[PDB]
Design a protein around this ligand. Sequence first.
Ligand code: HEM
Ligand SMILES: Clc1ccc([C@@H](Cn2ccnc2)OCc2ccsc2Cl)c(Cl)c1
Ligand SMILES: [K+]
Length: 455
Amino acid sequence: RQRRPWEPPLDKGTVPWLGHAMAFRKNMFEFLKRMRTKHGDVFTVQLGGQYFTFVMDPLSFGSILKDTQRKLDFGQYAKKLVLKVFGYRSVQGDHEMIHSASTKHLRGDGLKDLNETMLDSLSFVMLTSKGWSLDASCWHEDSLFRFCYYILFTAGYLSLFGYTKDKEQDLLQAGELFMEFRKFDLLFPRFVYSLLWPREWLEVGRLQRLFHKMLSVSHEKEGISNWLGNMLQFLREQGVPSAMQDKFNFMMLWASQGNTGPTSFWALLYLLKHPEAIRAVREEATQLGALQHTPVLDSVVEETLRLRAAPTLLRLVHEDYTLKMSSGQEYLFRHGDILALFPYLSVHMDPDIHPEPTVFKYDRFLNPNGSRKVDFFKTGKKIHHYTMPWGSGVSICPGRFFALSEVKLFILLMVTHFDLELVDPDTPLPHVDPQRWGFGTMQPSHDVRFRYRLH
Ligand code: HEM
Ligand SMILES: Clc1ccc([C@@H](Cn2ccnc2)OCc2ccsc2Cl)c(Cl)c1
Ligand SMILES: [K+]
């Protein structure tokens, strides 16, 4: 590839025939930081087979996301990724099925019917696996990350993929599945990057075949979410075999449980590390369908996602795309190239939009009167895209409302019915594990111990 004057700069790396794959996969966040300062806001690099063009100017996010014409497509790239990782082969129309099923059953009425079960399942799991002793004041030490993740995963799994007659048995396997899910989740970025030791490729194979069987469409379950059954109806109706339906189910299990848990971890952890904040939500909590009446919690969860939701927004260009920068410069993107945004660096951590951006400020999105603050600026200019945990366009997360009910209910239940303390409130928060930069909600570099007991 030879660059044309009208294209953005093309950086081939100091050592050519190697590129930036090594520095990119190691710490994507730091790699893009260096590139922004070196080439400015728009630059192109080769990763894997593809050529990627990054746009770091938040002001230009406007036209790109409102793809007025038909030029950018998220699904053409995503289907390649899920094929490698889950072996699911996209069929004509499944992209629209998912969104229809989601708008219909993960929003409005579908969502409240579902939220009622999620609450039921989250209460049952907390109580049953709580841990007990003959002494009623006994503290119980656990690991906060594994704790939150196991809770959201079990309740999420049972609310979506169905429960059975024996509700204790459900929990037991749900926990057994969790352990194996966590093993798959941990290898996932390196799987996407093919940076696995030969033994690890086998583990990913075993985990695949394992979930395929547990979630198999032949396997007695009652009351599965309308979201899932609606989607399998489409698949069976288009002649999708059952084996491929099993691969579909595993992909949706990972999609629906992959971030909700880790996001709960950071929120509760930020709340424990800021007495100011945990009291505001506890008090809001004390005083059914009240999830829409928690402005304080709402802002605690936006701020958490601002600090720990670091996805990449990828679009394949299938017709030559022309981007005009606020500056006054035009840039041409070739069809076949991957358009990429990293709103974490461009938006979340921009000090002009969010002063002291690396600081958890539970009230960051609250107006002095407690109303919702939706007015943010970069040097006088209004930024409609001030937080971007879900993305935008026709590919914005169709489960973001469920995820939010999921996380909000967990927090409320925890801060209400439990005494919480960090084993070591003096040590610094774990930093993001850099190997997952760009894949959704970040995960801690190391777990933190915490103790809990009832009131
Ligand atoms: C904190 C939790 C979550 C976060 C941070 C998150 C974030 C995201 C992001 C950034 C995207 C890509 C947006 C884009 O490319 O424009 C996405 C897409 C998607 N999300 Fe989520 N998500 C979460 C939870 C969930 C849940 C619970 C589900 C299902 C129940 C789900 C299902 C999906 C699906 C199927 C897509 C595919 C995009 C498409 O429809 O083309 N996500 N999510
Ligand atoms: Cl089926 C599916 C739907 C969305 C995704 C999101 C992550 N996610 C998962 C669940 N909710 C959000 O992918 C973002 C992303 C990061 C690097 S490449 C790439 Cl795509 C995936 Cl991985 C599979
Ligand atoms: K898809």
